Design an enzyme around this catalytic site. Structure first.
Site, PDB file in Angstrom:
ATOM      1  N   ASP A 297       7.638  -0.937  -1.818  1.00 48.56           N
ATOM      2  CA  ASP A 297       8.183  -1.310  -0.563  1.00 48.56           C
ATOM      3  C   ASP A 297       7.526  -2.600  -0.115  1.00 48.56           C
ATOM      4  O   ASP A 297       8.182  -3.542   0.385  1.00 48.56           O
ATOM      5  CB  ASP A 297       7.911  -0.189   0.480  1.00 48.56           C
ATOM      6  CG  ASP A 297       8.139  -0.644   1.863  1.00 48.56           C
ATOM      7  OD1 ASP A 297       9.289  -1.115   2.137  1.00 48.56           O
ATOM      8  OD2 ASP A 297       7.190  -0.573   2.670  1.00 48.56           O
TER       9      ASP A 297
ATOM     10  N   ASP B  53       9.502  -6.698  -0.522  1.00 53.12           N
ATOM     11  CA  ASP B  53       9.655  -7.543   0.639  1.00 53.12           C
ATOM     12  C   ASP B  53       8.778  -8.824   0.540  1.00 53.12           C
ATOM     13  O   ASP B  53       9.165  -9.917   0.988  1.00 53.12           O
ATOM     14  CB  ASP B  53       9.323  -6.741   1.928  1.00 53.12           C
ATOM     15  CG  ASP B  53      10.519  -5.928   2.413  1.00 53.12           C
ATOM     16  OD1 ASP B  53      11.652  -6.285   2.053  1.00 53.12           O
ATOM     17  OD2 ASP B  53      10.334  -4.915   3.110  1.00 53.12           O
TER      18      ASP B  53
ATOM     19  N   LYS C  39      -2.880   1.702  -7.501  1.00 52.78           N
ATOM     20  CA  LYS C  39      -4.232   1.639  -6.956  1.00 52.78           C
ATOM     21  C   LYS C  39      -4.981   2.762  -7.717  1.00 52.78           C
ATOM     22  O   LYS C  39      -5.476   3.738  -7.122  1.00 52.78           O
ATOM     23  CB  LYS C  39      -4.209   1.908  -5.472  1.00 52.78           C
ATOM     24  CG  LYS C  39      -5.491   1.589  -4.721  1.00 52.78           C
ATOM     25  CD  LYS C  39      -5.825   0.041  -4.759  1.00 52.78           C
ATOM     26  CE  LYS C  39      -7.161  -0.134  -4.104  1.00 52.78           C
ATOM     27  NZ  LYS C  39      -7.683  -1.483  -4.270  1.00 52.78           N
TER      28      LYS C  39
ATOM     29  N   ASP D  80      -3.497  -4.594  -4.049  1.00 54.32           N
ATOM     30  CA  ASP D  80      -4.117  -5.655  -3.244  1.00 54.32           C
ATOM     31  C   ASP D  80      -4.188  -6.929  -4.132  1.00 54.32           C
ATOM     32  O   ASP D  80      -3.927  -8.039  -3.669  1.00 54.32           O
ATOM     33  CB  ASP D  80      -5.504  -5.224  -2.703  1.00 54.32           C
ATOM     34  CG  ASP D  80      -6.443  -4.693  -3.818  1.00 54.32           C
ATOM     35  OD1 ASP D  80      -5.969  -4.048  -4.794  1.00 54.32           O
ATOM     36  OD2 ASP D  80      -7.673  -4.841  -3.694  1.00 54.32           O
TER      37      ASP D  80
ATOM     38  N   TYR E 231       6.523   8.903   0.451  1.00 55.67           N
ATOM     39  CA  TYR E 231       7.711   9.008   1.287  1.00 55.67           C
ATOM     40  C   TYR E 231       8.271  10.426   1.435  1.00 55.67           C
ATOM     41  O   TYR E 231       8.742  10.756   2.508  1.00 55.67           O
ATOM     42  CB  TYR E 231       8.804   8.148   0.727  1.00 55.67           C
ATOM     43  CG  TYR E 231       8.686   6.714   1.166  1.00 55.67           C
ATOM     44  CD1 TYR E 231       7.509   5.972   0.885  1.00 55.67           C
ATOM     45  CD2 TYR E 231       9.742   6.094   1.883  1.00 55.67           C
ATOM     46  CE1 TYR E 231       7.395   4.631   1.278  1.00 55.67           C
ATOM     47  CE2 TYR E 231       9.631   4.755   2.270  1.00 55.67           C
ATOM     48  CZ  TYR E 231       8.448   4.047   1.982  1.00 55.67           C
ATOM     49  OH  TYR E 231       8.325   2.731   2.341  1.00 55.67           O
TER      50      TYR E 231
END
Ligand SMILES: CC(C)[C@H](C(=O)O)[C@@H](O)C(=O)O
Ligand SMILES: CC(C)[C@H](C(=O)O)[C@@H](O)C(=O)O
Ligand SMILES: [Ca+2]
Ligand SMILES: [Ca+2]
Ligand SMILES: [Cl-]
Ligand SMILES: [Cl-]
Lengths: 364, 364
Positions: free
Chosen positions: A249, A253, A193, A225, A143
């Protein structure tokens, strides 16, 4: 002494829901003898309309003069053709987080009893229930990493973003996750990851270093994942999920939506001195705005997070939470929480806030 | 003339399932008079055991001498304490993709009729069904971008990865997605984080440029945190999902798991000349290995993708797919596809492959 709150209600349902949060705050202020002063500032789309940008200078300065930001929601179709860096949601939220160093995002998501049917999960999965806190690193990673931009023209034009983490950035978000687990079910799932990304290699390494200070807390690591698959299937197996900015993020959600009930969920973004930005987990829901339909519970509960985390008013925060519980178990639910055959029992936004504030007044 | 296939069965269930894919290939070879020669090479953990690294020089060279790679699965607890860059899964897959320029990953996921109960979705959501092709950019973005690494020591030690895309990279994966939509339900959902990332800004811009060539295909864009929520709730609304490397990784596994039936799903990773790497969507499932339990359908269907996409043997590919359909509608299902009261009807891996290959032989 007398707290100062920057109220940034934003767009869509932000104002009508913030009115209920403020109403419930008034009742808590009277019950606990709190002296809270509030000033409202334009943010997001109303700030573009009113001031030509999503985060006016005056709004920022109001936030610096405040003990916390009570934040509604930003964005809507009206600004959704703007060039992507002038847009309200990113233009209000990212500079807020960056300026106030709000590196810690807390988004707890649980399935409430009686609302299992609303979860998009298969009935035997929602019936097990879940309760997952996503702890998301909010001021670093891809970000805010540099270089970011683009170079070149035509086919070879390319654009770039840099995901960057230091040990220090990782360790301070990881301690937050472990401390939170310690007072929950004592498990941190760190999400990365690390099979691909150098930031994730250091991420995993550091969160393991932090773990030594929490010998009562179990740490496991999971790739993002895999975390997104596993949460769809057995969300009951997670306690605290600890993520970098991009991953958190996505994950926060995802489990929020797995609850089926986003209008109940709120968010705390805080820096290390107790200043923070408190908001509903869902968007500005522009389609339902000014209709007295939006669920104010998320904004109300954001105000309780603000009391707890910024104002150190734990009792007050807890009173609002229980007044919410009471609504939810006394047939005060807005339309989106009710199955289609029960949708005639829907309460309006004002009715919800009125009830919840009465409950606080009554000593819930 | 005579095709050459590099068979890289890997670890866990990879070999026992690949045996069934090869068995079904034999039947297709006889029915269509195909001349396919196969050579097996160690990859993943068995290559570490046997050759000291996950992608031996000899395995790579076997793949360059081949028309396609028929690939099983790699990884397992045995190698799961290795430093993250010596590990089997990333050490087999990323260099394979990079070397052969396999920029296009196709992972179609559908809910099969009769298997809705297995989907972790709520029953009325799985009953609507879905059928979503994830088109994922596989050789660029943050996976292969440079600089990647780390600098510094102590608290200020930091690590970094660069997400990088050029117009050219984006346009070639986008055309793949539009072309695929054109022959499906004519909708591409492009998935990015254009509100945050410069790669995503260019991503969105370019995929829109590609759209002019597909006036029959609807394009919408969605942010990845929204895409992950929306897929949990209304996966029936997507046709083709078009993603960069990191995002596609997350999304393809998410809808695969939403099917409830990963052992049926396969994957094509292909370069622009028709060479590709064909594999089951699920891992090496080490806990169930050598027991005659694994579902070979995913590996069998990988061989049909290989026929179609690399060997230009469309008839042969289609015959294997229908022999799979026939299994699935004639009570030939492995244990994980059956509800717990029906789990006594489970067929073994050999039984599944035997049936499916008989079906091909019989002219299905
Ligand atoms: C609007 C966007 C920049 C933001 C984020 O990615 O952080 C939003 O998705 C959120 O979760 O707050
Ligand atoms: C093993 C890992 C590098 C790989 C990826 O991220 O591409 C795997 O997750 C996949 O989906 O093939
Ligand atoms: Ca988000
Ligand atoms: Ca994956
Ligand atoms: Cl990040
Ligand atoms: Cl990427």
């Amino acid at each position: 002494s007398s707290y100062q709150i920057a109220v940034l209600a934003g767009d869509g349902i932000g104002p009508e829901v913030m009115a209920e949060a403020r109403k419930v705050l008034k009742a808590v202020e009277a019950r606990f003898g709190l002296n809270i002063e509030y000033t409202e500032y334009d943010v997001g789309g109303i700030a573009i309309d009113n001031h030509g940008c999503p985060l006016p200078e005056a709004t920022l300065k109001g936030c610096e003069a405040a003990d916390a930001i009570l934040f509604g929601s930003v964005g809507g179709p009206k600004w959704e053709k703007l060039p992507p860096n002038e847009q309200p949601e990113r233009g209000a939220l990212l500079p807020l987080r960056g300026h106030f160093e709000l590196f810690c995002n807390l988004r707890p998501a649980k399935l409430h009893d009686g609302l299992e049917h609303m979860s998009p999960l298969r009935s035997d999965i929602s019936a097990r229930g879940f309760d997952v806190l996503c702890v998301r690193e909010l001021t670093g990673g891809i970000y805010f990493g540099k270089p970011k931009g683009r170079q070149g023209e035509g086919e070879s034009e390319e654009a770039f973003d840099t995901m960057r983490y230091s040990r220090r950035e990782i360790s301070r978000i990881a301690r937050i996750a472990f401390e939170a687990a310690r007072g929950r079910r004592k498990k941190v799932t760190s999400v990365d990851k690390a099979n691909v990304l150098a930031c994730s290699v250091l991420w995993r390494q550091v969160v393991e270093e932090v773990a030594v200070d929490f010998p009562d807390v179990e740490l496991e690591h999971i790739y993002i994942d895999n975390a997104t698959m596993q949460l769809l299937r057995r969300p009951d197996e997670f306690d605290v999920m600890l993520c970098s900015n991009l991953f958190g993020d996505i994950l926060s959600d995802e489990i929020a939506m797995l609850t089926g009930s986003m209008g109940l969920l709120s968010s705390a973004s805080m820096n290390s001195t107790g200043f923070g930005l408190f908001e509903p987990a869902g968007g500005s829901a522009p389609d339902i705005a000014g209709k007295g339909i939006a669920n104010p519970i998320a904004q109300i509960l954001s105000a309780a997070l603000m009391l707890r985390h910024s104002l150190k008013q734990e009792e007050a925060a807890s009173a609002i939470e229980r007044a919410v519980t009471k609504a939810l178990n006394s047939g005060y639910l807005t339309g989106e929480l009710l199955s289609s055959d029960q949708r005639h029992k829907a309460k309006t936004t004002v009715q919800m806030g009125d009830f919840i504030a009465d409950a606080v007044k009554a000593g819930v």
